Design a protein around this ligand. Structure first.
Ligand SMILES: [Cl-]
Ligand SMILES: [Cl-]
Ligand SMILES: [Cl-]
Ligand SMILES: [Cl-]
Ligand SMILES: [Mg+2]
Ligand code: NA
Ligand code: NA
Length: 325
DNA sequence: CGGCATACG
DNA sequence: GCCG
Protein backbone atom coordinates (compact mmCIF):
# COMPACT_ATOMS: atom_id res chain seq x y z
CA UNK A 1 0.00 0.00 0.00
CA UNK A 2 1.73 3.23 -1.12
CA UNK A 3 1.87 6.19 1.24
CA UNK A 4 0.25 8.83 -1.00
CA UNK A 5 -3.42 8.64 -2.05
CA UNK A 6 -2.57 9.60 -5.64
CA UNK A 7 -0.53 6.40 -5.89
CA UNK A 8 -3.48 4.06 -5.43
CA UNK A 9 -6.98 3.62 -6.91
CA UNK A 10 -9.69 4.71 -4.48
CA UNK A 11 -13.18 3.78 -5.57
CA UNK A 12 -16.32 5.62 -4.55
CA UNK A 13 -17.73 2.62 -2.72
CA UNK A 14 -15.56 0.19 -0.78
CA UNK A 15 -15.26 -2.48 1.92
CA UNK A 16 -14.53 -0.49 5.09
CA UNK A 17 -17.23 2.13 5.13
CA UNK A 18 -17.85 2.09 8.88
CA UNK A 19 -14.18 2.32 9.83
CA UNK A 20 -13.48 5.16 7.43
CA UNK A 21 -16.55 7.14 8.52
CA UNK A 22 -15.37 6.95 12.17
CA UNK A 23 -11.91 8.20 11.32
CA UNK A 24 -13.40 11.00 9.26
CA UNK A 25 -15.41 12.16 12.33
CA UNK A 26 -12.14 12.53 14.20
CA UNK A 27 -10.68 14.36 11.18
CA UNK A 28 -13.58 16.78 11.09
CA UNK A 29 -13.36 17.37 14.85
CA UNK A 30 -9.64 18.07 14.56
CA UNK A 31 -10.44 20.68 11.93
CA UNK A 32 -12.94 22.39 14.19
CA UNK A 33 -10.16 22.74 16.77
CA UNK A 34 -7.73 24.07 14.18
CA UNK A 35 -5.38 21.06 14.20
CA UNK A 36 -4.72 20.67 10.48
CA UNK A 37 -2.00 18.09 11.06
CA UNK A 38 -4.24 15.68 12.94
CA UNK A 39 -7.07 16.29 10.43
CA UNK A 40 -4.74 15.22 7.64
CA UNK A 41 -3.59 12.04 9.33
CA UNK A 42 -7.12 10.89 10.16
CA UNK A 43 -8.22 11.76 6.60
CA UNK A 44 -5.29 9.81 5.16
CA UNK A 45 -5.88 6.83 7.41
CA UNK A 46 -9.52 6.81 6.40
CA UNK A 47 -8.55 6.95 2.74
CA UNK A 48 -6.15 4.00 3.11
CA UNK A 49 -9.07 1.86 4.27
CA UNK A 50 -11.12 2.97 1.26
CA UNK A 51 -8.34 1.62 -0.98
CA UNK A 52 -8.26 -1.87 0.56
CA UNK A 53 -9.59 -4.75 -1.48
CA UNK A 54 -11.65 -6.29 1.35
CA UNK A 55 -12.89 -5.63 4.90
CA UNK A 56 -10.50 -5.23 7.81
CA UNK A 57 -11.64 -7.91 10.28
CA UNK A 58 -8.67 -8.07 12.65
CA UNK A 59 -6.19 -5.66 14.11
CA UNK A 60 -3.23 -7.46 12.54
CA UNK A 61 -4.43 -6.40 9.08
CA UNK A 62 -3.42 -2.81 9.95
CA UNK A 63 0.23 -3.81 10.39
CA UNK A 64 2.39 -2.02 7.87
CA UNK A 65 -0.45 0.14 6.49
CA UNK A 66 0.60 3.78 6.14
CA UNK A 67 -0.91 6.43 8.45
CA UNK A 68 -1.99 3.89 11.05
CA UNK A 69 -0.26 4.46 14.36
CA UNK A 70 -1.33 4.11 17.95
CA UNK A 71 -4.36 6.42 17.79
CA UNK A 72 -6.01 5.36 14.49
CA UNK A 73 -5.26 1.71 15.27
CA UNK A 74 -6.99 1.98 18.64
CA UNK A 75 -10.04 3.53 16.98
CA UNK A 76 -10.26 0.57 14.59
CA UNK A 77 -9.59 -1.92 17.38
CA UNK A 78 -12.53 -0.64 19.41
CA UNK A 79 -14.84 -0.66 16.41
CA UNK A 80 -13.81 -4.22 15.59
CA UNK A 81 -14.30 -5.38 19.16
CA UNK A 82 -17.40 -3.47 20.31
CA UNK A 83 -18.93 -1.93 17.18
CA UNK A 84 -18.36 1.59 18.50
CA UNK A 85 -15.41 3.77 19.50
CA UNK A 86 -15.93 5.70 22.70
CA UNK A 87 -13.89 8.66 21.53
CA UNK A 88 -15.85 8.90 18.30
CA UNK A 89 -19.19 8.67 20.08
CA UNK A 90 -18.09 11.33 22.55
CA UNK A 91 -17.29 13.70 19.67
CA UNK A 92 -20.62 12.98 17.98
CA UNK A 93 -22.55 13.81 21.14
CA UNK A 94 -20.64 16.98 22.02
CA UNK A 95 -22.32 20.37 21.82
CA UNK A 96 -19.10 21.76 20.36
CA UNK A 97 -18.93 19.28 17.49
CA UNK A 98 -22.63 19.52 16.67
CA UNK A 99 -22.66 23.31 16.69
CA UNK A 100 -19.42 23.80 14.72
CA UNK A 101 -20.75 21.33 12.15
CA UNK A 102 -24.05 23.23 11.93
CA UNK A 103 -22.36 26.60 11.63
CA UNK A 104 -19.58 25.63 9.18
CA UNK A 105 -22.19 24.00 6.92
CA UNK A 106 -23.52 27.48 6.27
CA UNK A 107 -22.27 29.00 2.99
CA UNK A 108 -20.22 32.01 4.09
CA UNK A 109 -19.25 30.60 7.48
CA UNK A 110 -15.86 28.95 8.08
CA UNK A 111 -14.21 27.40 11.14
CA UNK A 112 -12.97 30.78 12.41
CA UNK A 113 -16.40 32.44 12.22
CA UNK A 114 -18.20 29.38 13.67
CA UNK A 115 -15.76 29.22 16.54
CA UNK A 116 -16.22 32.89 17.43
CA UNK A 117 -20.01 32.49 17.36
CA UNK A 118 -19.66 29.36 19.53
CA UNK A 119 -17.60 31.32 22.07
CA UNK A 120 -20.22 34.11 22.06
CA UNK A 121 -22.76 31.49 23.16
CA UNK A 122 -24.60 31.04 19.86
CA UNK A 123 -25.88 27.53 19.16
CA UNK A 124 -28.69 27.51 16.55
CA UNK A 125 -29.55 28.93 13.13
CA UNK A 126 -32.33 30.99 14.70
CA UNK A 127 -29.74 32.46 17.09
CA UNK A 128 -28.02 33.72 13.96
CA UNK A 129 -31.22 34.93 12.33
CA UNK A 130 -32.10 37.06 15.38
CA UNK A 131 -29.01 39.24 14.84
CA UNK A 132 -28.80 39.71 11.04
CA UNK A 133 -26.77 42.92 11.34
CA UNK A 134 -23.76 40.78 12.26
CA UNK A 135 -23.96 38.77 9.01
CA UNK A 136 -22.33 39.26 5.67
CA UNK A 137 -24.53 39.27 2.56
CA UNK A 138 -23.00 35.89 1.67
CA UNK A 139 -23.91 34.52 5.10
CA UNK A 140 -27.39 35.98 4.86
CA UNK A 141 -27.82 34.03 1.61
CA UNK A 142 -26.36 30.87 3.10
CA UNK A 143 -28.78 31.16 5.99
CA UNK A 144 -31.90 31.97 3.86
CA UNK A 145 -31.17 29.05 1.59
CA UNK A 146 -29.77 26.70 4.18
CA UNK A 147 -32.66 24.20 4.09
CA UNK A 148 -32.56 23.71 0.32
CA UNK A 149 -28.77 23.62 0.34
CA UNK A 150 -28.99 20.76 2.87
CA UNK A 151 -31.01 18.69 0.40
CA UNK A 152 -28.97 16.29 -1.79
CA UNK A 153 -28.49 17.33 -5.39
CA UNK A 154 -29.37 14.44 -7.69
CA UNK A 155 -27.87 13.44 -11.03
CA UNK A 156 -31.21 14.48 -12.68
CA UNK A 157 -30.73 17.94 -11.23
CA UNK A 158 -27.23 18.00 -12.73
CA UNK A 159 -28.42 17.22 -16.27
CA UNK A 160 -30.92 20.08 -16.07
CA UNK A 161 -28.39 22.60 -14.75
CA UNK A 162 -25.84 21.65 -17.37
CA UNK A 163 -28.27 22.40 -20.19
CA UNK A 164 -29.02 25.74 -18.67
CA UNK A 165 -25.35 26.65 -18.23
CA UNK A 166 -24.57 25.58 -21.82
CA UNK A 167 -27.31 27.85 -23.13
CA UNK A 168 -25.93 30.91 -21.35
CA UNK A 169 -22.33 29.97 -22.21
CA UNK A 170 -23.32 29.53 -25.88
CA UNK A 171 -24.71 33.08 -26.05
CA UNK A 172 -21.85 34.53 -24.10
CA UNK A 173 -19.21 32.97 -26.36
CA UNK A 174 -20.06 30.72 -29.31
CA UNK A 175 -17.88 27.61 -29.33
CA UNK A 176 -17.28 27.66 -25.60
CA UNK A 177 -17.62 24.30 -23.84
CA UNK A 178 -18.97 23.21 -20.46
CA UNK A 179 -17.49 20.22 -18.58
CA UNK A 180 -18.98 18.67 -15.44
CA UNK A 181 -16.30 18.37 -12.77
CA UNK A 182 -16.13 17.76 -9.02
CA UNK A 183 -17.83 14.85 -7.27
CA UNK A 184 -20.32 14.11 -10.03
CA UNK A 185 -17.44 13.57 -12.44
CA UNK A 186 -16.00 10.98 -9.95
CA UNK A 187 -19.28 9.11 -10.29
CA UNK A 188 -21.25 10.27 -7.26
CA UNK A 189 -25.01 9.86 -7.57
CA UNK A 190 -25.69 12.76 -5.23
CA UNK A 191 -23.85 15.82 -3.99
CA UNK A 192 -24.07 19.11 -2.14
CA UNK A 193 -23.24 21.23 -5.15
CA UNK A 194 -22.49 21.08 -8.86
CA UNK A 195 -19.15 22.07 -10.44
CA UNK A 196 -18.57 23.15 -14.07
CA UNK A 197 -15.42 24.04 -15.99
CA UNK A 198 -15.74 26.30 -19.01
CA UNK A 199 -13.21 26.90 -21.77
CA UNK A 200 -12.88 27.70 -25.47
CA UNK A 201 -10.70 25.92 -28.09
CA UNK A 202 -9.09 29.20 -29.21
CA UNK A 203 -6.55 30.37 -26.62
CA UNK A 204 -7.46 33.79 -25.25
CA UNK A 205 -11.11 33.82 -26.38
CA UNK A 206 -12.15 32.82 -22.85
CA UNK A 207 -10.95 36.13 -21.39
CA UNK A 208 -13.82 38.16 -19.88
CA UNK A 209 -16.17 35.25 -20.26
CA UNK A 210 -17.52 34.66 -16.79
CA UNK A 211 -19.14 38.08 -16.37
CA UNK A 212 -20.93 37.60 -19.65
CA UNK A 213 -22.16 34.23 -18.52
CA UNK A 214 -23.30 35.44 -15.12
CA UNK A 215 -25.17 38.38 -16.67
CA UNK A 216 -27.08 36.08 -18.96
CA UNK A 217 -27.98 33.62 -16.23
CA UNK A 218 -29.11 36.49 -14.00
CA UNK A 219 -31.28 37.93 -16.79
CA UNK A 220 -32.97 34.51 -17.09
CA UNK A 221 -33.97 34.73 -13.42
CA UNK A 222 -31.84 31.67 -12.56
CA UNK A 223 -29.50 33.23 -10.05
CA UNK A 224 -30.60 33.56 -6.45
CA UNK A 225 -27.12 34.63 -5.30
CA UNK A 226 -23.66 35.38 -6.65
CA UNK A 227 -20.70 37.61 -5.84
CA UNK A 228 -12.96 36.81 -12.40
CA UNK A 229 -12.15 33.11 -12.90
CA UNK A 230 -14.50 31.45 -10.39
CA UNK A 231 -18.14 32.11 -9.50
CA UNK A 232 -19.83 30.58 -6.44
CA UNK A 233 -23.54 30.77 -7.20
CA UNK A 234 -26.87 29.74 -5.82
CA UNK A 235 -29.12 28.74 -8.72
CA UNK A 236 -32.82 28.51 -8.91
CA UNK A 237 -33.54 24.99 -10.07
CA UNK A 238 -37.06 24.14 -11.30
CA UNK A 239 -38.90 21.37 -9.46
CA UNK A 240 -42.36 19.81 -9.87
CA UNK A 241 -44.66 22.79 -9.30
CA UNK A 242 -41.91 24.76 -7.61
CA UNK A 243 -38.11 25.09 -7.42
CA UNK A 244 -35.18 24.67 -5.07
CA UNK A 245 -31.91 26.50 -4.49
CA UNK A 246 -28.73 24.68 -5.56
CA UNK A 247 -25.06 25.61 -5.14
CA UNK A 248 -23.23 25.75 -8.49
CA UNK A 249 -19.62 26.66 -9.10
CA UNK A 250 -18.51 27.97 -12.49
CA UNK A 251 -14.88 28.11 -13.41
CA UNK A 252 -13.17 29.38 -16.59
CA UNK A 253 -9.74 28.33 -17.79
CA UNK A 254 -7.80 28.92 -21.00
CA UNK A 255 -7.58 25.77 -23.13
CA UNK A 256 -3.80 25.58 -22.54
CA UNK A 257 -4.53 25.14 -18.83
CA UNK A 258 -7.66 23.02 -19.21
CA UNK A 259 -6.07 19.68 -18.24
CA UNK A 260 -4.67 21.18 -15.07
CA UNK A 261 -7.96 22.84 -14.22
CA UNK A 262 -9.90 19.68 -14.98
CA UNK A 263 -7.54 17.66 -12.78
CA UNK A 264 -7.70 20.33 -10.12
CA UNK A 265 -11.51 20.59 -10.00
CA UNK A 266 -12.26 16.88 -10.28
CA UNK A 267 -10.82 16.11 -6.87
CA UNK A 268 -11.30 14.62 -4.41
CA UNK A 269 -10.02 17.36 -2.17
CA UNK A 270 -7.75 14.90 -0.36
CA UNK A 271 -6.63 13.45 -3.70
CA UNK A 272 -5.57 16.94 -4.88
CA UNK A 273 -3.69 17.70 -1.63
CA UNK A 274 -1.90 14.38 -1.86
CA UNK A 275 -1.13 14.82 -5.55
CA UNK A 276 0.33 18.28 -4.95
CA UNK A 277 2.31 17.01 -1.95
CA UNK A 278 3.67 14.11 -4.03
CA UNK A 279 4.58 16.40 -6.90
CA UNK A 280 6.51 18.79 -4.70
CA UNK A 281 8.11 16.38 -2.21
CA UNK A 282 8.81 13.34 -4.39
CA UNK A 283 9.32 14.92 -7.83
CA UNK A 284 10.40 18.48 -7.03
CA UNK A 285 7.66 19.90 -9.26
CA UNK A 286 5.08 22.51 -8.20
CA UNK A 287 1.47 21.68 -9.15
CA UNK A 288 -1.67 23.77 -9.15
CA UNK A 289 -4.85 24.10 -11.14
CA UNK A 290 -3.05 26.27 -13.72
CA UNK A 291 0.07 24.25 -14.41
CA UNK A 292 3.06 22.21 -13.35
CA UNK A 293 6.31 24.09 -12.78
CA UNK A 294 9.86 22.81 -12.77
CA UNK A 295 11.63 25.26 -10.45
CA UNK A 296 15.10 24.12 -11.56
CA UNK A 297 14.62 24.74 -15.29
CA UNK A 298 12.05 27.48 -14.53
CA UNK A 299 9.67 25.98 -17.10
CA UNK A 300 6.00 24.97 -17.23
CA UNK A 301 4.98 21.53 -18.46
CA UNK A 302 2.58 21.72 -21.39
CA UNK A 303 -0.18 19.14 -20.96
CA UNK A 304 -2.78 18.13 -23.52
CA UNK A 305 -4.64 15.76 -21.16
CA UNK A 306 -4.89 14.56 -17.60
CA UNK A 307 -3.07 11.47 -18.84
CA UNK A 308 -0.10 13.75 -19.72
CA UNK A 309 -0.01 15.11 -16.23
CA UNK A 310 0.04 11.72 -14.50
CA UNK A 311 2.80 10.64 -16.92
CA UNK A 312 4.92 13.73 -16.18
CA UNK A 313 4.61 12.96 -12.46
CA UNK A 314 5.57 9.31 -12.93
CA UNK A 315 2.19 8.07 -11.69
CA UNK A 316 -0.06 5.42 -13.22
CA UNK A 317 -3.20 7.07 -14.64
CA UNK A 318 -6.29 7.09 -12.42
CA UNK A 319 -9.65 7.81 -13.96
CA UNK A 320 -11.92 10.17 -11.94
CA UNK A 321 -13.89 7.27 -10.49
CA UNK A 322 -10.68 6.06 -8.81
CA UNK A 323 -9.77 9.44 -7.32
CA UNK A 324 -12.22 9.15 -4.42
CA UNK A 325 -9.60 9.45 -1.71
C1' DC B 1 12.10 17.55 14.59
C1' DG B 2 9.47 19.97 10.18
C1' DG B 3 5.89 19.34 7.39
C1' DC B 4 1.26 19.00 6.30
C1' DA B 5 -1.77 21.97 -1.19
C1' DT B 6 -2.62 25.66 -3.48
C1' DA B 7 -5.24 28.71 -5.44
C1' DC B 8 -9.09 32.70 -6.16
C1' DG B 9 -13.32 36.16 -4.38
C1' DG C 1 -1.19 12.11 14.13
C1' DC C 2 1.88 10.35 11.60
C1' DC C 3 6.06 10.00 8.13
C1' DG C 4 10.57 10.52 6.67
CL1 LIG D 1 -18.75 20.25 23.85
CL1 LIG E 1 -39.65 28.64 -11.28
CL1 LIG F 1 7.72 27.43 -19.71
CL1 LIG G 1 -4.88 26.06 -7.69
MG1 LIG H 1 -18.48 19.84 -5.68
NA1 NA I 1 -19.35 27.23 5.35
NA1 NA J 1 -18.47 23.14 -5.77
Amino acid sequence: MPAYACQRPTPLTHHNTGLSEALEILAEAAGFEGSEGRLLTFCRAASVLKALPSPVTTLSQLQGLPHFGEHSSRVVQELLEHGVCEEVERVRRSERYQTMKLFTQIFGVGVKTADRWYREGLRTLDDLREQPQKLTQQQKAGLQHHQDLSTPVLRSDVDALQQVVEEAVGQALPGATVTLTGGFRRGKLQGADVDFLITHPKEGQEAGLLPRVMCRLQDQGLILYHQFERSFCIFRLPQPGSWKAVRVDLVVAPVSQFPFALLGWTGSKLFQRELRRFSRKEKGLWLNSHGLFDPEQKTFFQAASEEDIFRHLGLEYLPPEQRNA
